[PDB]
Each structure stands twice: as structure tokens, then as C-alpha cells.
Amino acid sequence: PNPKAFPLADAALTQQILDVVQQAANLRQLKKGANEATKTLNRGISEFIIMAADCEPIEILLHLPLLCEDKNVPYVFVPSRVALGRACGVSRPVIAASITTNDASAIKTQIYAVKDKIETLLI
Amino acid sequence: GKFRTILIAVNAYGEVWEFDLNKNGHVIRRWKDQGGVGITKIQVGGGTTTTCPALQISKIKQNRWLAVGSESGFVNLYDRNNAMTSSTPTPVAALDQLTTTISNLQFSPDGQILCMASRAVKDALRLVHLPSCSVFSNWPTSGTPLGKVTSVAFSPSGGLLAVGNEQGKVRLWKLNHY
Amino acid sequence: VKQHLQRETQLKQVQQRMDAQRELLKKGSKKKIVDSSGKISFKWKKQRKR
Amino acid sequence: SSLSDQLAQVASNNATVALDRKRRQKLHSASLIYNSKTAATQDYDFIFENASKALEELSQIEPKFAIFSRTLFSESSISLDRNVQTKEEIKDLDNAINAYLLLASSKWYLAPTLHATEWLVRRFQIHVKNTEMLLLSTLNYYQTPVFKRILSIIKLPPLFNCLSNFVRSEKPPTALTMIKLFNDMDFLKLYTSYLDQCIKHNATYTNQLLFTTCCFINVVAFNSNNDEKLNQLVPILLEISAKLLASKSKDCQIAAHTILVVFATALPLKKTIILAAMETILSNLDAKEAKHSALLTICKLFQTLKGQGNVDQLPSKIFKLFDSKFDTVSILTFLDKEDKPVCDKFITSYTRSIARYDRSKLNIILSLLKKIRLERYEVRLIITDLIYLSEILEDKSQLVELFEYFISINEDLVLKCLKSLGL
Amino acid sequence: SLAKSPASTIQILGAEKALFRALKTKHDTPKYGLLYHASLVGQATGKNKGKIARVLAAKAAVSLRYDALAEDRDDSGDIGLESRAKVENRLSQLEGRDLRTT
Amino acid sequence: EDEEDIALEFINGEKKDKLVNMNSFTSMFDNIQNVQMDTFFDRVMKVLT
Amino acid sequence: DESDSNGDINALTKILSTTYNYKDTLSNSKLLPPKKLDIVRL
């Protein structure tokens, strides 16, 4: 939608991303909202970063790709904050979220497959 | 003396297909539900349908409401008379009273109440007045014997509602308006 | 430098265990699963918090 | 009962008499401007000096205070003791003070009013002997330091218990607490009595009238749950709406329109009740802004009616008076307005009334239907009435134009009505 | 850099001495920061001063990320106007909310 | 056609109308300081519809 | 003082004085009332 939201995931990739976001929510490995996502980036614990490409105005999450780039963390734009908030499993719209690092989870293979797909999409 | 039937089918992502069956399977249209991350039930209601069904060809009507209930508990709700014209529509409402997976939707034979009911937890049924799209507040109360609701059936004529649960005990109520 | 790295790793693991114990305090329907290697984990019921 | 209880009633009877120097110091120490020390120092000549000066200023600003300059602000009124006169003279003194409080209710952002009522407070003891009218008159100023001073002085009545919590504190009383105070029922009986007296003395103003209609709207919203509490809120608020509409001021008429629209969208009222309210509105409707507001609320009442006989014709005298107040050009401008508030049921009843009664403005009917998207049952009822009128009245080219318009848009419904009646 | 920082840092930003002393000593962290002298925190009263400092810091971070990263900036401040509208409404509602009994 | 289809025409013609709930009027008490009564009526109607 | 002996402005007061139940029940609308459900257990 918004042409400043560059890597915009499609139907299949967005379906994979929202499934792994749902699994990460039910494992409680997921930090929601743009401020908590920025905090995870500053601490250095994010596996990867999901944003919503239709937040108005867009800049309030455009601040995040800079830190994601400078710290080598994958980011992607799914196209709806309402659907992203329902995937994260909270009664609000959520414009950004982060899957955090813990190498003892039971969803690690899914997280690494989606993270590899996002790395390919940014590359 | 002529009608034509349409099949609506919903993906887990929220993409909705509408084929017609009179001429062969050919997609009339596609659109997308707003939000709808994992969508588990769709229902149409307010006219004739496979629950409150027709009895002669002249008594077939066209449905007005189309409700889409998802895994997170959210129930989007659409007006067909605007959705068919907008072709990627905005819901009339988005109900969020329940919190578990929506496992039953059931319109009245008229289409004035929408009964949405989960399956994953006890006491998880809510009735909705339409077109107000507002949840009724005085029933069910906290002492209503609902159980884990797995079946809901509205009556076509007498205004009954029948709810069946996991313990194996259906339970009748009669709405006094009808 | 190597000692710095080891100390920071030990502190990261301590904070991870502490945050797990903090998550076991709020709300929801936890289920105490045991991994058959013998290690305890927790899994919450699929229900949208409000 | 008990001896302490009977003595408590005796004390509240003799609450104001200064039987000793200590009670005198306390009673004369309570004041509106001066603090305890100087208020216990000074005297009636001082207070009356400031009173006469401030009343000269108040009479210069608004010329109705000359009568209080004749009676409540005279040297014989320096001399007379309230606690000694008989009950008849007490009653007449209370009428004088109540009339003054109704007049100087609208001027309380003014040191002249503060000084004049300082003399009333510290000579005639209004702040304990009749505090009801004091609080009701200065109730709309509820953030202001004048209300803070009034609260810190007054011993609060039975009905003002929320303010009995807020008395002598630092923050003002809050809007939710004013909603509590109005949400009691005997308070609403008292306040509607106060406003009826206020209208009959013809001194209302925009700030107070804003405040009281806002509190009434919030009372109806707070009791939106209880069908029973709403049903017993009906006679009070619709009686004050009747008196507020019988008033002459456009301000009172708009405030009554606001009460009417919110109460009829909160409670599904009877058809005769809605039509009677419409009749009073139109029977006193005079000004232009009130005309705009009255058209909006009439459309809203006719819409929120949902039931049997929903969309029937306006009766004879009501339709006559309505056309006399709103001839056709006005309603056509309202219909080609671009905000488009929904008014389909009122329009349909209007066209059915034109079809039965006037039988002339059928081109006007056609313009109405061209500007409005009616619903299906309304179109069916209009078509049925036009079929009956064509079969009774002589056929006319405007009627042919109407049926041509229907056949252009929605001919099969016309076929259905002809199949119900005709060939 | 100010836009890159999150909202809680923008709240805390002034009281860094008390912040880090309380962190290393395991006490309670300061709540105002440098935002004490803004007008909304100057209108709130106590616990409302804490809550309005939090809400105003969130809205200030929103405005900062807009203005530091805008490409077609209107320079009329409508984002700031609407954030002030939301903060004013939140504060007036939180002042209308009462603690005591009636 | 049938009388039930007449009733269904009534029901399907009925449109939605926003209800009043127990906290819908507080902004009026907020900005009621020095407004005019026509503006207050417009604000109440805009909240209603 | 009292002796009982163009539309007027006393119509609303007269109607309120006559009736005792305001919220109408004899509509029987074939509509459904919002936020208040009339249901019986069977």
C-alpha cells in the first residue's frame, strides 16, 4: 500500500509469518508494539521483526528498519495491522512485533525457516 | 420459477471465493476479509439457507448478512447489499466478546439475531441483535447451564433455540418475541 | 575480553530463566509440559487475552 | 427516641441564634470574602457600606436591583433580626431572598454580586437558613472559587451528600459527581420545580441552560439500562420539556429539543406521545434556529418510532400546523442538504398525508421521491395510497408522471400492487 | 537519535542519575524525567502526573518519529495537534475519575 | 407474494441506528464552557447519529 | 381557584396525565428490541 513500506510480503509468505507469530505468541516468545520491538533491538535479542504496512502515519514504525539494518536482523512488512494484532492474539491493532531469541523452543525450526525466507526476500 | 445457487468458500487466510453452481464451477468473484488471520467459520443468513430452508421455489429469498468468525474469537460481519458492490468490503461490525475459537454461527430464520458460540470453553455463547450489531446483555447470565456448547439450532417456526453441550444434554429456550 | 564474553553469556542465561519465572505469574491457563529429556517447559492455552 | 437525638433536633432548631459570645464569634466569622479574623472583627455598618456600593454598581449594570435597594438593602434591614420575626414575615423575607437569588444567579463572575451576597450571607443567614436556592442558583458555576467558598461556608442539605464529601477540600467537585447528584430522583423533582419557577420569572441564561440540559442527558445515559428507571424518569423530564417548550426563548426551545431527542432515542415511546410532543414543538415554534432544530428533532422522533402503524399518515390538524410552520420550499432545502440525516419515515408519512389531504402538490411529491431513497415497504405504501387516490379522485397528469417515475424506477413493485388491487 | 530511541527512554530522559542509582540498588525508578515541565504534566496532580508523563511520552515519541523521518512534511503540525487532542482528553477523563466515595 | 414476505420487506428495510450507552456524553461537560446552544444541539446530534 | 369549565402547547402534559405506561408494549412490531432479550427456559 504505502510505497515507503518496501519489503511487502505476499499471501504465502504472510501466511507462514502469521502462523509462526501465532505459535510464538502461544509460547510467549513474542514482544508486541513498536516500543517493545525497539527495546528488543537495543538489547540484541530479536530473531526477527514484523511490521504492518498500513499504519498511518508510516514513520512511527519507519524508525525500525534502520536499527534492523545496522544490527543485521531481518525485517518484513505484512500488509494489515488488524490481522497482525489478531495473530499476536490481543484485542488491539498491533503495528509491529518481534520474535525473540531462545534456542530451546519447540518452534525453532519454523522460526528459522521463516527467517531464512525473509533473508532471501531482503537479499 | 427460477433461482440460482452460489457457493462461498473461505481459506484460512481470509480470502473468499464465490462460485455459482447453475453454470458450472466458475468463480464469480473473489475478495478478502479485513483482518481475519485464521478464519474458521463463515455463515450466510437473513434469507433462506441450509438451516432455515425453503419449502417451495417461490419462497426463496436472498441473504442479507454474511458473518465470518475466526480462530482468535473475532467475528466480522458484512452486509451483502454493499459487499457485492464494494468487492473488497469493510465489515458492518467486528464483534469481540468471546475470546476462544468461534466454532458455531447461526442466524435466526429472519436474520434478526446472530448466535455465535465457541467450543473450547464453558459458557461461551452470545446472541447479537442485528442490524444494531450489539450483544444482548441479560442472557446468558452467570447461572445459565450451557456447558461446552457444541451444537446450536434455531427453530424455523416456533422461535425456539436449542443448545447441546459436551455432557450430552440439549437444552431448550423459547424466545417470546416470535 | 574472553572473560567479558563469558560473564555476559552467563548473565543472559540468568535473565532468560528469570523472565520465564516472571511469565508464570500473570494470567492465563498454563500447562506444565515435561520434555522427555526431563526438562520442564510451559505452554499456554490458545485464548485471546484482552 | 434518645436524649441525644432529641437534643440534636433542638440544636438544629436553634442553630443560628447567638446565645453566647463564642457562638456569635463563629457565626459572624463565616464569610464569603473576608477570612475568619477580619470577619470576626468587622461590623454591620462596614458590610452595609460595601453592600450599598456594590448594589449601585449592580443596578447600573442590570436595572432590576432597585427593588432590593428599596427592601433588602435599607437601614431598617440593618436593624432587623431574622430570628425574632414571626413565621409570616419569615416567609415574605424568604420570598424576597429567593427572588434576589434568581436575579443574581446569572451574574456571579462579578465582585459586585460577591459583595451584595456577602451582605445577605452575613445579615440574613441565607447560608444556613435557606441553602437550597443558594446551591441551585449557583450550581452551574462548579469549578469556580466562588463555588468553593459557597461550599466551605454552607452546611449541606440532605440531598447534596456528594458535595458533603467535597466540602472544604482543594479540588473542585467533578462532573461525574454532578452526574450522581442529578441521578437521584427527588433531586430531579426539586430541580424541575426550580426551573419552572425560573421560567415563570423569565430569567434563564445560556450557561445555566447548557449545564442543566447536559446533566439531564447524562442522567438518561446513566439510566439507559433500567427500562423501569427510564420509565419513571419519563414524566419529570417530559414535563420540564413541555414547560421549556412553552417558554418564549429560542434557547429554552433548543434545550427542550435536545432533551426530547435523547430521551426518545433512549426509550421507545408511544405513538401518541411522540405526536403530542411534535404538536407542542410546532405549536410554539417561532424562531429560525429553533425551526432548524425542530425539523431535525421531528425527523429523529418519527424515525426512532419502530412498531405497528409505524409510517401512517399525519393527522388533520397536525399536518395543517406542520405545513403552516414548514411550507414546501423549506423541507425541500432540508432534503437537498448534503449532510443527509436519515428521515425516511417522516418523509413517507408526509407524502401519505399530502396524498390524503391536500391532493395538489404531486409534483412536489415527485421531487421528494427524486431526492430521497425510500425503503421497500415505504414505496409499497405510497404506491398503494396513490392507487386508491387515482381510483377515487379524477386522473391527473401529475399522477401519470408519478406512475411513470415508478415504472422507470421499480416497475415490478407497481406490478405487485396492481396485482393486489386491479388488472 | 531522539527518534530512534523508544518512548520510555523519552519519558525517563532527564532523571538518569536517580534512574541508574535505583537500578543498581534495586529500588524504584523515577517516573517523571525531563517531561515534568511540559504543560500537561504541569496540569496533572500526583499519580495523574505519573500517568500523563507516560502517555505524553508515548505521543511525543510518535511525533518525533514523524518529524525526523518525514519526506513530505506538512510543517503545520497536525500530528502534534491530534496527539495533543488525545492527551488532553485522556487527562480530563483521568481528572474526572475520582478516588474517594460519594 | 405472501404476508410473511411483506413482514420480511419491513425487517429488511429497517436500517441500523446507534444506541445510547452509559458513558456516551462526557465531552459535553468538557467543552460546555462558552459554547452556543445551536452548537451544543449539533454536537449532541452528531454523537447520536 | 381551579374550575375545569390551532394546536395548543398543553398536549404533552395532557397525554402524560392520561397515560401511565409510556414504553409501548402493544406495538407487536415484528421487530426485535435491542439489548434486552425476552427468553424462557424449556
From Swiss-Prot, chain C:
Subcellular location: Nucleus, Nucleolus
Positions of region (Disordered): 19-50
Function per UniProt: Involved in nucleolar processing of pre-18S ribosomal RNA.
Self-association state and partner proteins as the record states: Component of the ribosomal small subunit (SSU) processome composed of at least 40 protein subunits and snoRNA U3. Interacts with snoRNA U3. Interacts with EBP2, FAF1, MPP10, RPS16A and RRP14.
Family: Belongs to the UTP11 family.
Protein name per its UniProtKB record: U3 small nucleolar RNA-associated protein 11
Originating species: Saccharomyces cerevisiae (strain ATCC 204508 / S288c) (Baker's yeast)
Curated annotation (Swiss-Prot), chain D:
Subcellular location: Nucleus, Nucleolus; Mitochondrion
Note: Present with 18200 molecules/cell in log phase SD medium.
Species for this entry: Saccharomyces cerevisiae (strain ATCC 204508 / S288c) (Baker's yeast)
Modified residues (N-acetylserine): S1
UniProt family annotation: Belongs to the HEATR1/UTP10 family.
Chain's role: Involved in nucleolar processing of pre-18S ribosomal RNA. Required for optimal pre-ribosomal RNA transcription by RNA polymerase I together with a subset of U3 proteins required for transcription (t-UTPs). Involved in ribosome biosynthesis.
Record note on quaternary structure: Interacts with snoRNA U3. Interacts with MPP10. Component of the ribosomal small subunit (SSU) processome composed of at least 40 protein subunits and snoRNA U3. In the absence of snoRNA3, forms a complex with other t-UTPs. This complex can associate with pre-18S ribosomal RNAs.
Domain of life (superkingdom): Eukaryota
The name this protein goes by in its record: U3 small nucleolar RNA-associated protein 10
Curated annotation (Swiss-Prot), chain F:
Cystine pairings recorded for this chain: none
Compartments, as annotated in UniProt: Nucleus, Nucleolus
Function of the protein: Involved in nucleolar processing of pre-18S ribosomal RNA. Required for optimal pre-ribosomal RNA transcription by RNA polymerase I together with a subset of U3 proteins required for transcription (t-UTPs).
Further remarks about this protein from its record: Present with 6560 molecules/cell in log phase SD medium.
Subunit structure: Interacts with snoRNA U3. Interacts with MPP10. Component of the ribosomal small subunit (SSU) processome composed of at least 40 protein subunits and snoRNA U3. In the absence of snoRNA3, forms a complex with other t-UTPs. This complex can associate with pre-18S ribosomal RNAs.
Protein name stated in the entry: NET1-associated nuclear protein 1
Organism: Saccharomyces cerevisiae (strain ATCC 204508 / S288c)
Chain's gene name: NAN1
Curated annotation (Swiss-Prot), chain G:
Subcellular localization, as worded in the UniProt entry: Nucleus, Nucleolus
Residue positions where Phosphoserine is found in the record: S3, S5
Top-rank lineage group of the source organism: Eukaryota
Cystine connections: none
Any further remark recorded for this protein: Present with 9570 molecules/cell in log phase SD medium.
SUBUNIT field: Interacts with snoRNA U3. Interacts with MPP10, UTP21 and UTP25. Component of the ribosomal small subunit (SSU) processome composed of at least 40 protein subunits and snoRNA U3.
Similarity-based family: Belongs to the WD repeat UTP18 family.
Function of the protein: Involved in nucleolar processing of pre-18S ribosomal RNA and ribosome assembly.
Protein name: U3 small nucleolar RNA-associated protein 18
Organism: Saccharomyces cerevisiae (strain ATCC 204508 / S288c)
Source taxonomy: Eukaryota, Fungi, Dikarya, Ascomycota, Saccharomycotina
Gene (name only): UTP18
Residues included from the entire protein: 180 to 238 of 594
